[PDB]
Write a protein that binds this DNA or RNA. Structure first.
Length: 203
RNA sequence: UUUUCC
């Protein structure tokens, strides 16, 4: 396709964090192009993603899309698992739009957002073995019920899990079922702490 | 063991 209109560029790019180690710009493009078409979120011929720039330190990427609306749609993939990792999809910090009718137009089945706001039933899960990737922890929690939001905390320099995560169930009543099923679980030198995150949050 | 450029 043609080059993108320059005055919509800020509205045609997204930050993508927590990318897989060793990923190429081509592999990232192919993943997003395929997911958008498989989800019915692109119907026009041709690829919705024009380019991917992976930062020199290889921890995040910026994606550029051919249209403003497809960029907004791609926000709905926040949290999608790619090679075991929860992709963190966000607006560029210098994107300042737009009040009226910037949020994804349609939801993507099975994708769980990484944005976990503090709230009544937000859970903290601590003591997790650090060999478990984002996918496996998400699966541990999804056993109890579908998730609305989830993030596993990792070291920003090594990519290794720090052994704790946060989540929110779709059904608020699943919260207590997950606590009963996981809190106090013993794993060698570690014991899971599973409780509403408000109970132990720093002040 | 309270989410990371141009």
């Amino acid at each position: 396709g043609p080059l993108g209109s320059q005055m919509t560029r800020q509205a045609r790019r997204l930050y993508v964090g927590n990318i897989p180690f060793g990923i190429t710009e081509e592999a990232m493009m192919d993943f997003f192009n395929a997911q958008m078409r498989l989800g019915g979120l692109t119907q026009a011929p041709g690829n919705p993603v024009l380019a991917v720039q992976i930062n020199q330190d290889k921890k995040f990427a910026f994606l550029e899309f051919r249209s403003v609306d497809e960029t907004t749609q791609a926000m709905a993939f926040d949290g999608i698992i790619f090679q075991g990792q929860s992709l963190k999809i966000r607006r560029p910090h210098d994107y300042q739009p737009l009040p009226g009718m910037e949020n994804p137009s349609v939801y993507v089945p099975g994708v769980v957002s990484t944005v976990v706001p503090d709230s009544a039933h937000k859970l903290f899960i601590g003591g997790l073995p650090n060999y478990l990737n984002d996918d496996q922890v998400k699966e541990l929690l999804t056993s109890f019920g579908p998730l609305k939001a989830f993030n596993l905390v990792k070291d920003s320099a090594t990519g290794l899990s720090k052994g704790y995560a946060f989540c929110e169930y779709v059904d608020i009543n699943v919260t207590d079922q997950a606590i009963a099923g996981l809190n106090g679980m013993q794993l060698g030198d570690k014991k899971l702490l599973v409780q509403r995150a408000s109970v132990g949050a720093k002040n």
